[PDB]
């Protein structure tokens, strides 16, 4: 049986990046040239793996993360990157082994009247650790005065709304992004190719 990549790539809903979704891929064969031979991806770069040599290789655990970010934030979805997304929403380890896939989704994630359901974490007291998913809503203290869990000046709700109006610039338009993680452990392989 073939790996259910369509469940995440062809999903109707995607998650906000702060609450990014994770789907583990196991006990199946995965044809990656099917994905590599699609012209419908703005970005698809791989790290620590050759995308061509991926159909003849096995891995212990394969994960598929999916979320929505701006076009100009797709650069942040890479090992060692810096910024609001990479540091506060979705961080990849330095030794990341996998592929980052993204495509424009302005047609689906920005309708007449915009779309303010996609959120991202604008503030955090410290950077995320890799593969951490912070969904807390503690009021962030931006200035000197303490907040005490109430919103006010310099005391912000940590999650901020993406604009995502239909006639935004290409870099402020929503992009759907799937990250494939190829973890290799001294353990049985659960995902291979032909």
């Amino acid at each position: 049986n073939l790996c259910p990549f369509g469940e995440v790539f062809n999903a109707t809903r995607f998650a906000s990046v702060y609450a990014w979704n994770r789907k583990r891929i196991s006990n199946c064969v995965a044809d990656y040239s099917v994905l590599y031979n699609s012209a419908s991806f703005s970005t698809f770069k791989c790290y620590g793996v050759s995308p061509t040599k991926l159909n003849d290789l096995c891995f212990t655990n394969v994960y598929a993360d999916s979320f929505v970010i701006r076009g100009d934030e797709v650069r942040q979805i890479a090992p060692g990157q810096t910024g609001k997304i990479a540091d506060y929403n979705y961080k990849l380890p330095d030794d990341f082994t996998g592929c980052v896939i993204a495509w424009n989704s302005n047609n689906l994630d920005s309708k007449v009247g915009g779309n303010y359901n996609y959120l991202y974490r604008l503030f955090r007291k410290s950077n995320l650790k890799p593969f951490e998913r912070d969904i807390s809503t503690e009021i962030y203290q931006a200035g000197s005065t303490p907040c005490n869990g109430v919103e006010g000046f310099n005391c912000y709700f940590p999650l901020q709304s993406y604009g995502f109006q239909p006639t935004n610039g290409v870099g402020y338009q929503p992009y759907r992004v799937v990250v494939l993680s190829f973890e290799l452990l001294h353990a049985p392989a659960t995902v291979c190719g032909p």
């Epitope: 990014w20 994770r22 789907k23 583990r24 994960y63 380890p93 330095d94 030794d95 995320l128 650790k129 890799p130 593969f131 951490e132 998913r133 912070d134 973890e183 452990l185 001294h186 353990a187």
Partner: antibody, heavy 127, light 111 residues
Framework: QVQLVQSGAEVKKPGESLKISCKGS????????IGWVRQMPGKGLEWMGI????????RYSPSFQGQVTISADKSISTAYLQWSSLKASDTAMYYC????????????????????WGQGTLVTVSS | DIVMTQSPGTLSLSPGERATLSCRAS???????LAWYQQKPGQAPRLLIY???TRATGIPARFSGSGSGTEFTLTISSLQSEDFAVYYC???????????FGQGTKLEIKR
């Protein structure tokens, strides 16, 4: 299978230095925190410190800050705990334990607490 | 910063009864970042509860954790022979900076 293994029992003299190790397998060692817990004979658990092996972000309890040193070697998936000058009052069982952060989502769901423990390293410091 | 106080210190019960274990905090663990462990003689502790109310994988349903704020409770409804051991509560509210255990509570088979 996730497994944390600790080094063997240690019998030392006061003033001697000591380093004990904790090696993890069956999971991404750099993605989970590793805590160190002390249990003196017939007593309860005491948190000593914690380290994230991905970047060696190390956090100590104020009762053990400067008392001891916690480190890690990613290349051998090992966390360390070491004293520069052991003392008789350091005679105890020393547990290393894996602790996923309350935010860690690497499994597809959230976890918490010291979920996996080593078998402990017995350290006896006597004259 | 936060002190954890468990009650009672030691308790004797037969199997089939219910054990109600209390864990007090000097401040409010407002994150519910509290865990429960079980330790048997000559054995490492074992995680039972995390997040104050969520059972770890494999833990039977007779173990139930509850509480918020400053009082937290571990309730073991139908005691079995293997349940009589020492139990600890952990707080990790200011992650990752501070962890604190309680002194423990020992369960003792009645006879």
């Amino acid at each position: 299978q996730v497994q944390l293994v600790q080094s063997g029992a240690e019998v030392k003299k006061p003033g001697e230095s000591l380093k004990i190790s904790c090696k993890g397998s069956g999971y991404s060692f750099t993605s989970y925190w590793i805590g160190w817990v002390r249990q003196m004979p017939g007593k309860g658990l005491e948190w000593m410190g914690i380290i994230y092996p991905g970047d060696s972000d190390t956090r100590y309890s104020p009762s053990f800050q400067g008392q001891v040193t916690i480190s890690a070697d990613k290349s051998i998936s090992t966390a360390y705990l070491q004293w520069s000058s052991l003392k008789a009052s350091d005679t105890a069982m020393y547990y290393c334990a894996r602790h996923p952060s309350p935010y860690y989502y690497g499994s597809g769901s959230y976890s918490g607490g010291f979920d996996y423990w080593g078998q402990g390293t017995l350290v006896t410091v006597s004259s | 910063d936060i002190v954890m106080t468990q009650s009672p210190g030691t308790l004797s019960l037969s199997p089939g009864e219910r054990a109600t274990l209390s864990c007090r905090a000097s401040q409010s663990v407002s994150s519910s970042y509290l865990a429960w462990y079980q330790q048997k003689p000559g054995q490492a502790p074992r995680l039972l509860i995390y997040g104050a109310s969520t059972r770890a994988t494999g833990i039977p349903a007779r173990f139930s954790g509850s509480g918020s704020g400053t009082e937290f409770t571990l309730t073991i409804s139908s005691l079995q022979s293997e349940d009589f051991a020492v139990y600890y509560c952990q707080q990790y509210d200011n992650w990752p900076l501070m962890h604190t255990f309680g002194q423990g509570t020992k369960l003792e088979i009645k006879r």
